[PDB]
């Protein structure tokens, strides 16, 4: 079927949109940034709609059936329960898109009578009716990117707030248990960055002769069929569940997850969806499990030898035994053909790599730097141009996503986070006197609440003490940050190191948790290096909820 059908009504915005920051004609830096950075807006929504609209065909085989059989058997070991209304309301982010039925996230979180009873009606109607399509809203996302032309806006398709709370009651427990039970070590959301690196290094070391590849599906959400989505339901149903959960899961699958009508922000009929919805609770878990099933079946069909997989939504990495370059090339072509028959064709054809550092996935690659010992330390990094361009946009135009914060946390050991992002954002929090204010950052369908003064303990827990003592960065990492700073019109590394010496001194001059930030985060900025010891507060952090899938949008709150 067609991934989408359209009426011709425009995908409309709800808030003001800005494609580019204003130019200062007397600044060369301002011109460089203007030439390089843009924000996607609803103006390009039709270009995206055209790309994501195509017919899907699937040809399954015995390899697919056998993998699916094993997944259902692994799912049967899972016992999951309904969440209470109270639990589902507390998982709702404070600024989650309001309901059309006269209440918002504030009323959901406080359990106001009207919100609670409207959610009661949605729940009862899910139990009563297994078939009527649930309406959704389609919106164009506003995201900042760098040229090299321009990407059109990504589209988000989501149901009403009342429906989103019911999805949590019915399926949140499944999201916490099922992926690990069916995928084991392949489930990408269970790892801290240091644990992810360790897993990849172990997978690489296990092979006598390793070969790795990343596989990127073109428009993954649109390639997801009604059948893939009904198969996801049979996997959820393989769990031990109360009957009421089974009923709600089945109605949500048939009325929402498989497809339905889409409306623009003005309330006009925009189209009809027959693929994955980008803004539902099951988006990330569903994409991860479905990508894993197709990829494991395709490994078997291609004859990939001893594959070790890592799956994060539609991002997939396979590390296996090289059969030599010629056979690897043939086997990757056979893998691609099988993924295409399963309705998962590639954007760019996969390429075999004989060095772990040469694989890119989730925009990241493994790099090496020296520890305080002089020992080689491995960490995840990425090209910093877009993260630095987003941080510059966020400095001038406040966003609740706070991409700069999510980047400082995920990429804490990188040169660009330590020298540029930490220096810049610790300076702004100090000048504004907002260091001790809790902030939220959005990432992979989840909203996390973080105190910037807790960053040293969070970084130590996610990356280890090595994050505060990395030095002697690879030439590629040095060239990458220097080029990104030049291209964006920013001052060079030498200016950032001078500013960091002052930010560190100012932080240490405040005492308490701020001095801890100065000492641990900016130990690279000084000549006389302090010996950094484990932070006791690192062990006391409850970061358990940080290692799971979120809800498209992102609609799972962690505080
Ligand atoms: C470290 C940068 N991010 C990532 N970098 C990555 O690099 C790879 C990768 C790269 C090269 C390669 F050869 C193999 C794999 C990822 C991968 O699994 N691909 C299949 C991958 C995933 C995340 C990622 C995704 C979701 C959440 C979080 C997270 O850490 N989240 C918090 C802070 C909340 C715990 C991090």
Curated annotation (Swiss-Prot):
Free-text activity regulation comment from the record: Activity is up-regulated by PRK2/PKN2-mediated phosphorylation.
How does the UniProt record describe the way this protein sits in the membrane?
Answer: Single-pass type IV membrane protein
Residues that hold Mg(2+) 2 according to the record:
216, 314-315
Protein location? Host cytoplasm; Host endoplasmic reticulum membrane
**RdRp catalytic domain: from which residue to which, for each copy?**
210-328
Q: How is it modified after translation?
A: The N-terminus is phosphorylated by host PRK2/PKN2.
Q: How does it assemble?
A: Homooligomer. Interacts with non-structural protein 5A. Interacts with host VAPB. Interacts with host PRK2/PKN2. Interacts with host HNRNPA1 and SEPT6; these interactions facilitate the viral replication. Part of the replication complex composed of NS2, NS3, NS4A, NS4B, NS5A and the RNA-directed RNA polymerase embedded in an ER-derived membranous web.
Q: Which residues of the parent chain are present?
A: 2443 to 3005 of 3033
Protein name, as recorded:
RNA-directed RNA polymerase
The reactions it catalyses are: RNA(n) + a ribonucleoside 5'-triphosphate = RNA(n+1) + diphosphate
Q: Which domain of life is it from?
A: Viruses
- The record lists the organism as Hepatitis C virus genotype 2a (isolate JFH-1)
Details of cofactor binding: Binds 2 magnesium ion that constitute a dinuclear catalytic metal center.
**Which cofactor is recorded for it?**
Mg(2+)
Q: What does this protein do?
A: RNA-dependent RNA polymerase that performs primer-template recognition and RNA synthesis during viral replication. Initiates RNA transcription/replication at a flavin adenine dinucleotide (FAD), resulting in a 5'- FAD cap on viral RNAs. In this way, recognition of viral 5' RNA by host pattern recognition receptors can be bypassed, thereby evading activation of antiviral pathways.
């Amino acid at each position: 079927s067609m991934s989408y059908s359209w009426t011709g009504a425009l995908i409309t915005p709800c808030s003001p949109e800005e494609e580019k920051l204003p130019i200062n004609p007397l600044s060369n830096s301002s011109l460089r940034y203007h030439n390089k950075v843009y924000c996607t807006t609803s103006k390009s929504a039709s270009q995206r709609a055209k790309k994501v609209t195509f017919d899907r065909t699937q040809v399954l085989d015995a390899h697919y059936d056998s993998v699916l059989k094993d997944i259902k058997l692994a799912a049967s070991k899972v016992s999951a329960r309904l969440l209470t209304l109270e639990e589902a309301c507390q998982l709702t982010p404070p600024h989650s898109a309001r309901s059309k039925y006269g209440f918002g996230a504030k009323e959901v979180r406080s359990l106001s009578g009207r919100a609670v009873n409207h959610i009661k009606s949605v729940w009862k109607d899910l139990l009563e009716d297994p078939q009527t399509p649930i309406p959704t809203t389609i919106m164009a996302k506003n995201e900042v990117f760098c040229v090299d032309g321009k990407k059109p806006a990504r589209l988000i398709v989501y149901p009403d707030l009342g429906v989103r709370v019911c999805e949590k009651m019915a399926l949140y427990d499944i999201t916490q248990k099922l992926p690990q039970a069916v995928m084991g070590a392949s489930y990408g959301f269970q790892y801290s960055p240091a644990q992810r690196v360790e897993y990849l290094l172990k997978a690489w070391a296990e092979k006598k002769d390793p070969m790795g590849f990343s596989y990127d599906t073109r428009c993954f959400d649109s390639t997801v069929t009604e059948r893939d989505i009904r198969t996801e339901e049979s996997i959820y149903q393989a769990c031990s569940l109360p009957e009421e959960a089974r009923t709600a899961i089945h109605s949500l699958t048939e009325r929402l997850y498989v497809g339905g009508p889409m409306f623009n922000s003005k309330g006009q009929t925009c189209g009809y969806r027959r693929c994955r919805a980008s803004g539902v609770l099951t988006t990330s878990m569903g994409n991860t499990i479905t990508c894993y099933v197709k990829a494991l079946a395709a490994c078997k069909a291609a004859g990939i030898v001893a594959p070790t997989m890592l799956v994060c939504g539609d991002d997939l990495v396979v590390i296996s035994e090289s059969q030599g370059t010629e056979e690897d090339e043939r086997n990757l072509r056979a893998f691609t053909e099988a993924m295409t028959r399963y309705s998962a064709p590639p954007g760019d054809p996969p390429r075999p790599e004989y060095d772990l550092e040469l694989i890119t996935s989730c925009s990241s690659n493994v790099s090496v730097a020296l520890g305080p010992r002089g020992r080689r330390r491995y960490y995840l990094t990425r090209d910093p141009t877009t993260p630095l361009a987003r941080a510059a946009w966020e400095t001038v135009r406040h966003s609740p996503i706070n991409s700069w914060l999510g980047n400082i946390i995920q990429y804490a050991p990188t040169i660009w986070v330590r020298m540029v992002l930490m220096t810049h954002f610790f300076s702004i929090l100090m000048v504004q006197d907002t260091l001790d204010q809790n902030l939220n950052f959005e990432m992979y369908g989840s909203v996390y609440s973080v105190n910037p003064l807790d960053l040293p303990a969070i970084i130590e827990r996610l990356h280890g003490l090595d994050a505060f003592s990395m030095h002697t960065y690879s030439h590629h990492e040095l060239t990458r940050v220097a080029s990104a700073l030049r291209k964006l019109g920013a001052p060079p590394l030498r200016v950032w190191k001078s500013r960091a010496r002052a930010v560190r001194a100012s932080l240490i001059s405040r005492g308490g948790k701020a001095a801890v930030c100065g000492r641990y985060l900016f130990n690279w900025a000084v000549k006389t290096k302090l010996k950094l010891t484990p932070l006791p507060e690192a062990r006391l952090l409850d970061l358990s909820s940080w290692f799971t899938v979120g809800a498209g949008g992102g609609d799972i709150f962690h505080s």
